[PDB]
Subunit: 201 residues, 6 copies
């Protein structure tokens, strides 16, 4: 029966959250991790081995691949999710330590403190999501073409190179974009709810 | 002995379900995951490495493979099962939170609320199953041929390409189709049972 | 001490079983899974990479391998064991739910029902085992030859192809055949025992 | 504190065993599994990929490798250890069921039975160990040479083939032989001890 | 409820630490391990297979790769983190044994001892971090170029070699540098806090 | 609270050990296993695939690699650590059985026995460490060169072969040597401490 304290921690963490936000956002996180781990990761395995270019010049393939893909999508998404998730872990740790301190105080001697941190955490989650989306839009966009044109040394003039699994990667990119937009919308809804409940005093 | 609450949750979740539906559908889910994870996943490993075409044109193999297989069957099935499974997780979370709230109410102060959500969840499960089946039928069908004809640039004119393990993949496709049909039938039976028990009032 | 209920479930499941059948069949199942997972699976890894044919015709190797091996032995055995095992899982789930219902009845209000299902489960186990054995005999037999003759398009005339690790695979095939025969014999013995104890009334 | 029953089972299983046999044989089993899993398994990975022969004849490498290595050492040892280990599992299951039955009898109604089975189990362990050793001696011996001579069709006349990592495999073969001999000696010692304690009555 | 002793150990370990240092440094450690394990490790997989040089001389690629990369970044970072982490494990073990001894003393008979060790541990953590940073700066720097010039035997004169994924590796190098700097700053802050609280007596 | 017996076993095992030896040696063991498993194992993966020799003679590479590396360093270290660790496991098992027997005696009937075994275990640990170090020194030494000269049949005259990652392997070899020396020194210190405390009687 060593689970009541965990329930108390869960209740105290979600004091200012809405009823449906909990379920929707947690299930979205689970869906995100499962999709990233099971199917998405396997499709990018042969991203460089199957990358080919039409030329006899040694070294052109390496530089052209580097230019086309400065960073892989999967690792970009891993960084995105880690950055989005860290603030909640920080908040949980802070709440745990605060609860221990309060237990000490209330045992030995038989708003604003936490609300501000929660608001800051939600704001930073949204900011990171938006920043990652903007960076992805600026760098790659939201689609991939089968043929790429390379004009980098030591390749002479321009050369044509061919990618691997472009359509499938485009589909998964669209899926991840939709997931990110949904998460951002839910966080914004939570912010509006907290502010609109705080205005009434 | 910290298991009674889990039993209470299980009983409350399955209030409106039939006796045999529980067992049949749960065992079907276990069978589905085991089949997808153990045998099916390994057969598609060399889907692109062993794919070959008769030509000297560089890049033709990549584009022809992309055209033939816009998305792999295994990842399509993973998406299908995730979409079919998420609604039950949402319902479980909702029931858990509702039970906690009711415990609070009934401790401190010593139909339609949940039935509608259950019906909606079952309906969405069936809808997703049917939609995925229709998409699969429209895109690929339910069989694979050994020889494929490719007429995409930069391949000149038309070329012939050869697949890997077509018969085995066809067999597994038929198996998965049967599993999906059985699941859809069971969900429809559950819907009919709930409606026919609700008509009598 | 939250294990007495598990013992009650175990005792109720094995009410009509013999003393030695439990041990022999469970240990046989463990042996089967270990043998299939540790050694058998690794020997078939290079089943297609090491498959070679004497010809310059592109695509002949793919079609000849597909014709020779419509389905791999390992996946066939995985399907066989899953089909043989599912009925017991169904019976366990049914017994669990029945026990919960009986506990409810006997707490709030302080043969043939299950025997038939057990007999049906044993019969279906035996039927599946026999059917899989017959299919394997019809398709492949119980041995593999080092040289295969291929007469499928686009291969011109007939060609000779060579397999990988035929003797070892033959040995493992014989092992699995013996295991299947032993399991079938044990199930038949259980059926005869139950019927011969039921005749006496 | 749900561990006393496990201790009772352990004590009842080892009623007729010697003091040091327990420790020595259990640690030997752990050593065997660790050695087989960590280092031995990795050395045989490139057993066929690195196998090469001096000829242009297609298919000669496959048949020559099959002739040289009808079965791999690692899988042979896996089978050996499984066969040696199963009897103890059978004995444990029998003891568990017997203990449950005796508890039932002694609760509701408030030598030779097991000794024979234990002796049989030890005898079968020793017999399997000796048989596997004899088979290994007859087939391969206890050493491997770097050069192999192949005289099987379709190879013309005789050809020379070269193995991978012969010295390391020889070293590990000697290690496993020593382990098997030690296990056999310990089992024989246990048999002699039980018989010499039973003679005195 | 066998968790109170763990809480006592946690409280005693963190007696002299600041409130926010706990959370920030622990979350930083988790972030570090996750980043090193999920994304960073996969990008260096084809570090040598995809490394290519322009020459027909056999053996030049091996020596040139060895000269360019005396040690991989990932393994260097693994060593760095292990060295940074070991002192805390030592301190935890010492505290555990001291607590057991004190419990013995205070049951049977019904500053400076630990502060010095904690200060030493923090100092060694910082020293190791700084030393690893200096070594990395001296050997590689904090960037990678696409083209490398090799002048080692048996390569004739000088040759040009090409790396794999230079930009992505540079990005991850910068990330790890930032993480290391943050950790060093936090440790220095902890040292200053302890000394400034000890000066006041 | 089923952990007191584990604490009693831990205390009884470490009756004659020093205060700091426990922590230092246990942390050294953890460091050893982590270093061997995470970084060291990956660097030797392409030990044979990337091994190349300058010749057209088939089979020369195999024999030259076998001559250069009769056994891999990683597997040698695995054997070393297993041999060093087994005696402590034997001692733990002996202590466990002795404690059970003493509990039986002291419940039903309401130095030198163990010290000698502990001394023997420490001595054998040190002996194995020294023997493995001597064997490694005699066979390989403590460094690796980039170029190897091979004079084994069927290679004609002498040939030059090139290794993979020599500098990194040398670094790790030095690390492991330092670890082994530290462990040997700690064991010798423990032996001296026990003897010097036993002399005083
Ligand atoms: C914050 C957490 C970061 C998440 C993250 O990035 O992990 C990715 C997925 O990992 C993962 O979490 C992989 C999850 C694998 C789950 C597979 C089995 C689940 C089936 C469900 C059980 C049903 C009962 C990394 O990517 P990576 O770790 O995969 O890349 C390594 C391939 N070596
Ligand atoms: C909702 C859950 C999603 C299920 C799902 O898609 O997982 C698939 C199977 O994973 C899996 O669940 C793999 C299951 C592996 C089980 C193998 C051992 C079970 C034996 C039974 C024990 C008997 C006692 C993914 O596919 P993937 O994760 O395999 O692809 C990665 C290869 N790296
Ligand atoms: C009903 C259950 C289905 C059984 C089944 O088909 O699983 C096979 C073996 O899985 C398995 O169960 C693999 C078992 C691996 C066990 C290895 C370690 C056991 C050592 C014993 C511990 C002693 C203490 C699948 O085949 P697959 O999952 O292997 O194919 C995937 C390679 N990725
Ligand atoms: C475990 C820690 C030992 C503490 C202990 O005494 O546990 C005993 C159970 O034995 C046991 O601990 C048996 C557990 C067996 C599984 C643990 C080993 C796993 C790996 C084995 C690989 C195969 C070899 C109970 O004894 P008690 O003091 O409560 O006396 C009760 C007599 N009425
Ligand atoms: C009866 C049991 C059969 C034993 C058996 O044959 O298993 C072998 C080793 O498995 C194994 O048991 C592998 C054991 C792997 C252990 C590695 C980590 C242990 C480190 C110790 C922890 C210290 C704290 C199979 O061979 P295989 O399963 O390896 O072949 C599959 C490669 N996919
Ligand atoms: C866990 C859930 C927290 C609930 C909880 O309060 O547990 C406390 C133990 O702290 C802990 O929970 C410490 C557990 C440490 C391991 C869990 C983290 C694993 C991953 C860490 C990676 C490295 C960073 C006990 O506190 P109490 O309320 O009973 O007060 C007793 C004071 N006398
Ligand atoms: C001190 C500890 C040393 C840390 C360390 O160096 O481990 C690295 C990462 O290991 C790791 O710790 C790998 C972590 C893998 C985690 C993937 C799944 C986590 C998803 C989160 C779950 C959310 C719920 C080694 O590198 P390596 O072990 O990877 O190299 C082996 C590839 N065979
Ligand atoms: C006595 C025990 C023998 C130790 C031993 O030799 O195991 C080595 C390392 O195993 C291992 O123990 C591998 C350890 C892998 C740990 C990776 C994740 C740890 C991160 C820390 C978590 C922080 C929270 C074997 O080598 P091998 O088993 O690797 O070779 C197999 C690659 N298939
Ligand atoms: C090695 C271990 C320590 C890493 C995995 C453990 C934690 C990092 C896990 C446990 C619970 C997880 C959280 C569960 C659900 C949410 C949903 C979501 O949080 C919300 O803002 C939604 C509201 C809520 O669910 O509380 C963002 C991810 C997050 C914080 C997860 C982030 C990762 C967490 C903290
Ligand atoms: C990382 C973890 C959180 C993912 C795995 C845990 C859950 C997602 C699992 C636990 C129980 C599973 C469920 C068990 C059985 C069913 C059968 C089936 O549900 C039904 O409608 C049948 C009726 C019933 O069994 O209740 C559909 C899948 C589902 C919900 C499963 C979906 C996945 C669930 C929710
Ligand atoms: C992911 C999890 C849910 C899958 C693994 C759990 C179950 C599917 C396991 C637990 C116990 C296993 C059973 C243990 C032993 C038997 C022996 C045998 O059953 C018998 O008819 C023998 C008589 C008996 O042992 O009861 C056939 C396999 C079976 C049912 C096993 C089938 C697989 C079972 C049900
Ligand atoms: C998937 C699971 C069910 C497989 C692994 C669990 C069992 C098969 C393990 C648990 C304990 C193991 C046993 C522990 C130690 C011994 C030593 C040895 O037995 C003896 O005769 C020595 C005397 C003794 O230790 O009792 C032979 C292997 C054996 C039986 C082991 C065989 C494998 C056992 C039964
Ligand atoms: C196989 C097992 C034994 C290895 C993994 C277990 C330990 C080595 C883990 C458990 C807790 C971890 C610690 C948790 C957090 C910190 C943060 C940080 O410590 C600090 O100085 C911050 C202050 C604090 O958190 O106490 C440095 C890493 C460290 C000690 C971790 C190092 C690795 C530790 C000791
Ligand atoms: C599959 C399982 C059974 C294998 C892993 C479990 C054991 C083999 C582990 C548990 C505790 C480990 C021990 C923990 C620490 C030590 C340090 C060291 O022992 C000492 O002499 C130092 C003094 C001490 O720590 O007691 C040598 C390794 C050893 C015995 C370890 C050897 C491996 C042990 C026995
Ligand atoms: C596999 C080896 C063959 C095992 C067959 C053993 C069958 C013996 C049955 C004993 C009596 C059961 C009631
Ligand atoms: C061409 C030589 C084939 C030899 C096959 C021998 C296989 C023996 C299998 C024994 C099975 C034992 C049943 C458990």
């Amino acid at each position: 029966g060593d689970w009541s304290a965990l329930g108390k921690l869960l209740d105290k963490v979600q004091a200012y959250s809405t009823a449906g936000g909990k379920v929707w956002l947690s299930v979205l996180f689970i869906f995100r991790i499962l999709l990233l781990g099971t199917a998405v990761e396997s499709a990018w395995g042969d991203e460089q081995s199957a990358f080919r270019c039409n030329t006899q010049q040694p070294g052109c393939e390496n530089v052209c691949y580097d230019k086309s893909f400065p960073i892989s999508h999967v690792r970009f998404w891993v960084l995105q999710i880690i950055f989005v998730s860290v603030p909640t872990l920080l908040y949980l740790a802070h709440v745990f330590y605060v609860m221990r301190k309060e237990e000490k105080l209330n045992k030995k001697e038989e708003r604003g403190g936490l609300l501000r941190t929660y608001i800051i955490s939600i704001l930073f989650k949204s900011i990171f999501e938006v920043a990652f989306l903007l960076i992805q839009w600026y760098i790659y966009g939201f689609s991939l073409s089968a043929v790429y044109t390379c004009k980098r040394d030591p390749c002479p003039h321009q050369v044509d190179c061919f990618l691997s699994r472009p359509t499938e990667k485009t589909i998964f990119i669209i899926f991840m974009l939709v997931v990110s937009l949904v998460s951002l919308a839910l966080n914004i809804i939570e912010l509006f709810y907290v502010f609109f409940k705080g205005v009434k005093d």
